[model samples]
Target chain A: IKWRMQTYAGAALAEHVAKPAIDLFNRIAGDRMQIELYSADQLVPTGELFRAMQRGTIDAVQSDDDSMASPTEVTVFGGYFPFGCRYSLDVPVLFNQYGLKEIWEEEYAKVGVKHVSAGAWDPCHFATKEPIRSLKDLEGKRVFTFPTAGRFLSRFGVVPVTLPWEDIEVALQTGELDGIAWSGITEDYTVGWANVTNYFLTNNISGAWIGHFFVNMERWEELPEDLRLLFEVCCEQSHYHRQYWYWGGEARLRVHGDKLELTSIPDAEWDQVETAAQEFWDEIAAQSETKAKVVEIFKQYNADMRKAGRPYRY
Target chain B: TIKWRMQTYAGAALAEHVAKPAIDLFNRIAGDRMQIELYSADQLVPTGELFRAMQRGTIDAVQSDDDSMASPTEVTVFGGYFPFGCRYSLDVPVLFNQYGLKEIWEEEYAKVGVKHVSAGAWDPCHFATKEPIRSLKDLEGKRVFTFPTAGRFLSRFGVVPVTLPWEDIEVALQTGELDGIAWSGITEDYTVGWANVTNYFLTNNISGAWIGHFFVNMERWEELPEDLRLLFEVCCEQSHYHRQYWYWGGEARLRVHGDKLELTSIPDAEWDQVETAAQEFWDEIAAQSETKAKVVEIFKQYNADMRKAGRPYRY
Candidate 1:
């Protein structure tokens, strides 16, 4: 069997993560099963990866949950909630040990998709044409970013715009966007976002930006048990390698300070941001029982992490 | 153009998280200049043969520590970990960079024909128990699993030390063959599924910072051009910084993973007894060699400074 897999990560990221995983899978499966991997916007736009999979235009996709627009409530979590996790390691356990894996799988099964694996990509930080150093500084500024983060930022009088990845740089240059809240220094640098943006926020909007491996359910059920195991195993390796590379890449790219001026939100102002985020989380939670469950887990995780003190909080 | 092979003392899970990233980063930056292939524990050589393998030029480099090397020298033994050397994880970098421990270890490693690339902090040595240990007496008669140095000191408090293969730890805890484990911090406990079998965690750790080193064969090190060497150093430095936060984050996050395992701390007065006994043990180690003696002095002065500063580490 042959499969076509597309990942939202383009450029260096797809090479580092998707290609290697697909390479290994193809080698191990030999002719029994093989995957041809495509980077973002190769066959379809990043936003349409889920729909393409549903229509069987693609066999599988390794993308951020938020990037998929279906099932708005579940996909919102893919965008990352406010103060969801203090660290990357917390993410895997929360998804696997907590109810997230089951919730995501159940939700995706309804839409004819299979949730293969869960993991975080990289932290998210804002890069802008002008410096955003305070809460008031955000007023009237237009930034292209995740829907959830954009909603939270809108409360502070900021305009949140959605633009395709290919068009973002041009938009920023033409004054259509004041900034973008997409990825950390590494992704921004690799994708040329750093060169176009002048000011970079030192604060991470989300410590662990979550992503998942999703496969078309009909194709998934057709696979033999052993073959399915091999596919999942390949995905697991890809997720872990992706995480390690991204973590190191974040630090490596921060050295390229020649392009963007680094700035940070003051602790007091950031605390207010967190407060606003909590209110937004409440709004999200009230939508459904599953959403409420996710919110409760986040609250418990934050309380536990903060209570642990050093390393987690202070 | 050059290609090299490296092995880390960590198993597959940890090597991926802790060691592979640094090597990957170096390879990426080095590009055609060099590539270092990273292998997890026992992939290229057994953990016991790591130092010997690298020294023999069988491998180009290794990411391991004194304990994993099974080196008997005082410097190597004490360099791995001691009960009271670092009061917090951050102190590991300060003690190494500011207090001259890094230089001392480099000199010692140079004797074995290896170059010390960098030494980074590992997770604290904490115990996960099948029963809550709120006092020293609570540790009495429990079959606790730990390393040799820690086992010796913990034995003084009437704790029975049991040595088991790493894979056997979880089953040992489940079968009542082991009452507790001094293996690692909350991250490892949860990752390895020990948290599922254990009823409590000792909030106090035996040592706050267990140091791990990145060592390259001296011959291989000399073969690298100066620029490439510096590039590799920067990679390890950045990797070290990231690994600390990764481990720290796990500690904080896992600490709150439900009340399945209660976080218990030994009474302060009882913990003081353990610290006093650890000092006595340090004296025994210091008498082994002139090098060990100097390390002890540095350790003492660092602790004194931490207390005097009265922030972060002490008071």
Candidate 2:
């Protein structure tokens, strides 16, 4: 049967990893498994990509796990922990030692999507037109953030301005925000943030490992075992390519900083920032039994991996 | 009671995120005798002209970064894209102790008629791209977006780096004006909506970049009562902590591909190439001037010490 895949990301999506996977799948399966691709908002708005798939509006989807986080109890599986894992070092350690992949798979099955693959983004940071070096500098400045950040920074005196990712550019353009604290290197450049803001503050506070690639469970069920294996192989190949592209973007950011003003805060201040953030993390972790257990499990896994001298993946 | 104008290229929401909390803390601790009339980006002038606006005193204080003034050799301090340095959280204090960045900043600010009092560093950067960048060969001839220090660093890799403002990046990507950007993180990817454009996110913990101080017009600062000045200092300090935690928390909220977004680690060989590139970049910076030399000296010293301390900063 022919399959239609939909995603929010546009041409940039086709230019790299996904397109190749699609082509390979077609080459192998030929007429038995034809596939069509659609950008997010092409068939439906980006926000609706998941719903469309769930309702069988689309045969399958090429997307991150968190897209279903809001509705499917499974969305939480995409990220390892609320604030855990930000770099390549954390990826293998977290997945293997911590068993995050296993846990994620279990959770994902609940959402009616089969986990296909995973990739990492650079750690997240804050970007602003104005440079901020210390906590005092952030005083009274309005920040655009998500629900988690809004709660976490509130203790230190930040008034979080919440918005969806789609609104950030318009918000920045219209003067509705001072800055956004979000993802790193490759993603920022792809979004064109280099031209809008003056500085990118690399906090390294939270490296991000986004959701695994997924397909509708129903769709997977319809495929022959051979076709399923073919799809899995494609996912595995895409995973490798995705990792390559991610690093490529990071190198590019540095070589081209002349036009973009990227900055990092001093070490002392960054320590202070980390210490303060840790306090918040601990407090939040303590507030929920399930969350606290997850945190402990994640932490212990890292410790064990380090002890074994096999902690970091990359 | 006195009111002063504080303008920035950020929006009111962002201003509130940082400034509001600080001001409230200031009012509670020091007294509500002084008030600041906050102007979001474009309220007084466009985001691009903020530095000039501050220089001319069109605004008492304008929040901005160092790269904006790269024309001045001394202004590169805020271009946190230094290669071969430890992450900011691990190395910033050491840099401060060894080089006395605050003192140097005060001296430079004095010349500009501004008083640099406090600052906050954000997170380290990595890359996000449409193409897989696994090795040095992968980078060859690829068109990548970059800023000042980052661009210079990437030159060793044989990549074509283009300089553009943040606002224009989206257009560039949309039009194939560029292939990728390497200045943000996962949370930032979500914030800037890169997930809407690209598919892969690479986790390269190359270096931590930071934004520098909040400066006040020297004349304006001098006019403030000592009590109010202290209040402002406390406020800025507290806000830095708030900003950091808030930023860290956003990492938890980032959405990745259930099918689209993919996060990957670079190969060891590729990472080695990057490390070599970083060393060359650092050597070049160290050779620039006595000041650059001094900065590098302190940076290297701290880096060595941190490694010895055995608790290098982690994400």
Candidate 3:
């Protein structure tokens, strides 16, 4: 039996993101099974996506959890937190490699979603209009980003703001927003976001934007075993396609982004800023049992990364 | 000018398949920085003598995968494959990669004269029988190939293990002298002419990678400069690539053998039986040593994690 999947975005996200995986599934599985792709709102409204999934209208969600209209709290953990799991290599596949993938799946199962594979946007950064050298410079500035980054940056005195992507360009022009929370370097440049924002803070809130592919638990289990395996492989591949929003964006930015002033945080300043980020993570973790577990996993993942350094690796 | 001598018994098979590809890649990148001379199993010294040879430094490294040494050092079983253990679990590589498998490997192998470098999977160990076996009773009271390495595992399941080489397998099966054989599949399709004799392949009993190695001498490994040493690490890593070829090519031979050979997909319940037997063996090992128990615990964690994740091996 063929499965149906949908994503919240189109073109690149739909194309490079889900198509490659769907194609691979088709090839590996041949006629034994297949997953046909549908564009956002093709089958139903965006707000109705998760409900449709629960109703078995579709089999999997191709986008990260945050993109959902009313995202689940567990999806927040799946979504990137401030300085959470940006570098997949940090876990070096230990979490996934060591079976943390299942724990992540179980977490999603709490909400009637069966995790098929991990997913995420590229790392996040601050695209600003001026050269901001330190935390002091961020004070009183209107920053545009979603909740996680919005919350984390508030401690620095910057007023975090949110605007639709369409609204961001105009806001940056009129000072309605000073800096915009972005998808990736050079990526936003494709649409001339570079024209308005001259400085890229690169503060490296990094990928506070990640999630996973999930099927309505009912639909997921209904598939035959071999079909399920094929679908899972495709899902895993998309999670790995974290590159375009990531390496793809940066490589392009470096090549065509000479006019952009990119700011790199010095180590000493980062230490002070990182401490504040940790305190914020602790506060959120203390807020809920789920957040605490996610926070603990993040903390332990970092600890394991340090201990797992290669011989003579620093 | 550091020259490391290595040995393995698989000769033309292992050498032509794994060593040539990896060592050739290594030389192209790190030419003459370090030279690794590989000898097929027992070419320089018998596999039985590898421990003494490494300790004596007569050989800087030995390509070995037997746990017979586990009696003297329980950690060797962790290094090598154990019967009914997860030799093919996806976590096999991850344990050493992201998880703490390599760190424990280094710590354990360090006590011996060899330095733990990398792990490899050269297909899986298998059992081929002339008769069909779907249940535990079908496996019991049957004559099968259970060598010194796998003898204990076979004995538990009512298998009357036979010790015979490839030359005797055909006649043994023809004359009803043997019911089956245990060995690496596919490649043996040619050597043992298993395609002609056996009709079924029992896959779920994959014992270990049945093939991991410590190809470094602690003293010699320590002497290399940092850059030169990373090059050695790179080569060992490349070996894992060639290593997968050994496992990947296995199915093709099984597939090509066609209807003549049935790939007996052992049910999880039967696998559970084998795993329990192996677990019993693991518990016995834990009773005797400190490091063995810890390494065993790591495998348990790995096994639990992989099973929960719905790893594709069994299903």
Candidate 3 chain B least-lDDT 10 residues: B306-315
In model 2 chain B, which range of ten residues has the least summed lDDT? B306-315
> How does each model score on TM-score?
0.65, 0.49, 0.48
Candidate 1 residue lDDT tens string, B1-315: 898998876667666677777677666555686899988767887767778899989999888768747754556766445776775655666567656888888887788788888777878888899888888888889898876667777888888888765556778899999998886888877766788999888887778778777889998999887756766765676567556556666777667655567888776777888888989988987888898889888888766665543212343
The DockQ-based CAPRI class assigned to model 1 is: incorrect
DockQ-based CAPRI category assigned to the predicted complex of candidate 2 = incorrect
On TM-score, the candidate that comes out on top is 1
Q: At residue B14, what lDDT does model 2 achieve?
A: 52
Candidate 2, residues A67-98: lDDT per residue as tens digits? 43335433433432345663443553355344
Native interface contacts kept by each candidate, as a fraction? 0.16, 0.00, 0.00
TM-score head-to-head 1 vs 3, winner: 1
Ranking of all candidate structures by their TM-score, best first? 1, 2, 3
**By TM-score, how accurate is candidate 1?**
0.65
Off by over 4 Å in 2: A1-314, B7-32, B37-43, B46-48, B71-78, B88-90, B97-99, B251-260, B312-315
Predicted complexes: DockQ each: 0.08, 0.01, 0.02
Q: What overall lDDT, based on C-alpha atoms, would model 3 receive against the true structure?
A: 0.61
Fnat of candidate 1: 0.16
